[PDB]
Each structure stands twice: as C-alpha cells, then as structure tokens.
C-alpha cells in the first residue's frame, strides 16, 4: 500500500484547537474529522484537516453519526480554495483506537477508496511520536472472527513546508539543539533511542501478563513474531565477531587519532598567530 | 640471584655465609623459594616424573614433595603428574569491554563538544 | 529444543532420533530447508548441520512464561545502559 505517511504541522496544530474548541465538557471523549491532503510516489502527505460532527455514546459502542452532507458540502469550500488537495483520511484523537473506528472507514471509504487514519493524541506526555497512522487491510480467516478485517500500521513523520516550516521555528523560539554534532547525535538518537526500546520491551512486558491472569486465549500470532524476535537476536559475542568487531571499532579510532592530530596543529597554529599579534602590539607600545 | 631465575647459586651461597650460619634467614628464604618454584612449574608444561623434581634442590629421596604435592595440585595418576593451563575462556569477550568502551568515546564526546 | 547458543546437531545425533542412517541424512536435511521449514548449512567434514531459523510453533501456556523471564532479563540489561550513558554523559544532553 502506502510505505509512510508525512503529517504537516497545521494538520496537527488543526487536531489539539480543534479538542479544545469542542471539549468544555472535560472528563472524555473522542474528535473525529476528515483529512486532506496529496502524495506522491506512494508517498502520502497530509495538509489540511477540518472539523467532521461527530457524537457516539459510551456504551453499546456501534452507534455514531458522521455528517456526510457536512463533509460533501465543506469539501465544496476547500476544493475552490485549494484544488489540489483532496480527500486522503480521516483523524481522531481517540488514544486507544476505539473498537467502533472500523466501520467508520468504510463510510469515508467512498470519497477515498484507500483512506489512512491518523491517530493524533492531544494530551501527549510522553516521549514517542503523536502519529500514528493506519491503513485498511482485508482477509478473512477461521481463528478471530466469520468477519474479519483489521487495520495495518504505516510509518509515519512530521514533515514540514518551505512556508509552515519559517512559522513552526518562529513558534517556538524555545530551545534548539544548536550546535548540531555529537551532542545532538549522543542526545537525538542514543539515549532517545533507549528510552524508546525499554518502552516497547516494557509493552510486550505487560501483554504477557496474560501467562498468569488470561486477557485473550493465546493470540498465536503474537507469540509467533516473539519467537522469531528471540531467534534474531545477534549471536553470542564470543566467536570470530569478537575479533571481527575490534578489527573495525579500532580501525576507526585510527581517523579519530589523526584528526585529533590536525585538530591539536590548528590548534596550536592558531594560538601562535594570535600570540605573536598581542606581542608585536605591546612591543610596539612599549 | 632472587631477581632472575638463576638459583642454583643460591644454594650454592646458602652453604658459604660470610658472617656466621645465618639459618634464622635461610630458613625464611625456604618460604621464599619452594613456593616460587612451584608456581613457576604450574604453567601448561606436561607430566614431570617424581624423579627430577625429587632430586634437583637438596633432597634424595624425602616425603616432603608428598606433602608439597597434597597442599598444591599435581593430581596423583600413573606416576603421571599434570600442569593445565588455559586461560581461553575468559578472554575473547567484548561485553564487559562494552561498558569500558562506553565510558571512554563518551569522554572524548564529552571533552570535544562541552567548554572546560 | 536446543538452545540457540550450541545449535551443532551432528549427523549421528540427528540420524539416531529420526531413524536413518548416517549415509541419508543428507538427503533429510536439504528436504527440510528446500520446501522452507528450517534454515541453515551443511558441514560434512566433521557431520554437522547448523540451524539457525526453526519455524515458530505454539506454547501454550508455560513456554510462554519463560519468554517473560527473557524479557525481564532483558529489559533490565537495557535499562542500565540507558543511566550508564544518562549518568557519564550529564554535559551533552538537554
């Protein structure tokens, strides 16, 4: 299908006033829109997104409503405005993806035949991405359901526009990784990194609670990807990678040897033509 | 003498003392010999027969390598004695390296980028 | 059954559990890895075969009690190498 999905940031700065411009009612619930945008080389992008009414009461949750003349006639609107963008998905906060949110595909399903949704969390306090955007994927079997039809994840990232991109720096004016080298390397990806690995680990963790206290009755596939994880773990550090690995984390120490060399000469060079300069400038004085 | 492994003089000097018997130190330099000279045949070598080390210090034909072989190793076999060494499991391994190796380029990150 | 790290089944081991001769297991060990169902290489100068991918199969509720041991050993072993560069690298970060 779709290899990733690029979310702009008026898209995402569109989804959190849209939650607070509906949510004076403050304990829960869900804001459910239709989003817009274009792609290219099975590649999605995502601009503009706008409000689609939507209520749903908590229990018995096969009960919504979506305006489809709301949708066809503000498309109206943005179609004359922009006519390159054109309907690509839908939206909605909806942090756990609600049960409910797989027959509501196929109502957008008309003005889109391959539509993603993008869920969007508005309250995020966390370290991953606020985006995660799935896709429509059909097959029927013997295990789960006579029914079957399930959503399949695509990669997705914040991109950025020549345009957004000079108002979204100018936003924040916060903090910066200036300087942009090792520190933001040993910052950015490395520890960030961890922190995002523990917290998968830590998820599988907590769905293998199952062993003591059943939740479902043994999902059999997800057991099998956890095999084939364990297999693929890297094999035992003792053999002739050990010599393998030295033969190259020593071979780059020796560039590392020699641009501290050059590093060291320019060094030196530099304090020297500033030296001789104050001291030509004082002997001259007195 | 002591420094190198020469110690055929040793004893060679402990029967000509200048000042007197001295034997309340050559008593002290026993300590001092028999257990070095048992560590240094622990290496990988092989069957050494109870016929060279019995003979070549000062003694003929005593029990006291009975007891120095039962307070060291030298497993009683056929008149086999054996010395293993390996030290080969042990080495070969980068994991605990991984930690040391870590700390390091993290200094040379850490002193190449802050302002000292 | 045998743990990832030895993996060596010889060719005596593997004839002896299925019962062929030495002389045939060959032609077993390419029928297992021509129709897909295990992955590895054929040694026959000292007869071992090494697996490296068996198909997965179901556990039904014990094995799968270990495999949160092996995540909880290894969670922790992540763990302590996110502080170890979290603690000697304190200047670069932030």
Known sequence: ?286 | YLMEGSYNKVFLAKGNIPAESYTFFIDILLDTIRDEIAGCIEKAYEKILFTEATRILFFNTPKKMTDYAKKRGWVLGPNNYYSFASQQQKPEDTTIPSTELAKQVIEYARQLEMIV | ?94
């Open chain 1, 1 to 286: 299908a779709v290899q990733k999905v690029v979310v702009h940031p008026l898209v995402l700065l569109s989804v959190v006033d849209h939650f607070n411009r509906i949510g004076k009612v403050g304990n829960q619930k869900r804001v459910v829109g239709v989003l817009l945008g274009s792609w290219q080389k099975k590649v999605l992008d995502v601009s503009n997104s706008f409000a689609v009414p939507f209520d749903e009461d908590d229990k018995d949750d096969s009960v919504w409503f979506l305006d489809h003349d709301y949708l066809e006639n503000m498309y109206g609107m943005f179609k004359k405005v922009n006519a390159r963008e054109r309907i690509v998905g839908w939206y909605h906060t909806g942090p756990k993806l609600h049960k409910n949110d797989i027959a509501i595909n196929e109502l957008m399903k008309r003005y889109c035949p391959n539509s993603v949704l993008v869920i969007i969390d508005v309250k995020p306090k966390d370290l991953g991405l606020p985006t995660e955007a799935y896709i429509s994927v059909e097959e029927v079997h013997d295990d789960g359901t006579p029914t079957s039809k399930t959503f399949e994840h695509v990669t997705s990232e914040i991109g950025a526009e020549e345009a957004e991109e000079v108002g979204v720096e100018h936003l924040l004016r916060d903090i910066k990784d200036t300087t942009v080298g090792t520190l933001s390397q040993r910052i950015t990806n490395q520890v960030h990194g961890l922190k995002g690995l523990n917290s998968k680990l830590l998820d599988i963790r907590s769905y293998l609670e199952k062993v003591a206290t059943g939740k479902l009755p043994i999902n059999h596939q997800i057991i099998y990807q956890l095999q084939d994880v364990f297999n693929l773990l890297p094999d035992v550090s003792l053999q002739e990678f050990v010599k393998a690995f030295y033969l190259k984390t020593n071979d780059q120490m020796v560039v590392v040897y020699l641009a501290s060399l050059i590093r060291s000469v320019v060094a030196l060079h530099n304090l020297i033509n500033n030296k001789i300069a104050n001291r030509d400038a004082e002997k001259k004085e007195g």
């Open chain 3, 1 to 94: 059954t045998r743990p990832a790290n030895h993996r060596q089944l010889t060719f005596e081991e593997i004839a002896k559990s299925a019962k062929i001769t030495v002389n045939e297991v060959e032609l077993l060990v390419m029928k297992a890895l021509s129709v897909g169902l295990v992955k590895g290489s054929i040694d026959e100068v000292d007869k071992r075969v090494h697996m490296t991918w068996v198909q997965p199969r179901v556990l039904d509720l014990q094995q799968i009690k270990g495999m949160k041991d092996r995540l909880e050993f290894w969670c922790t072993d992540v763990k302590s190498m996110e502080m170890l560069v979290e603690h000697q690298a304190h200047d670069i970060l932030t």
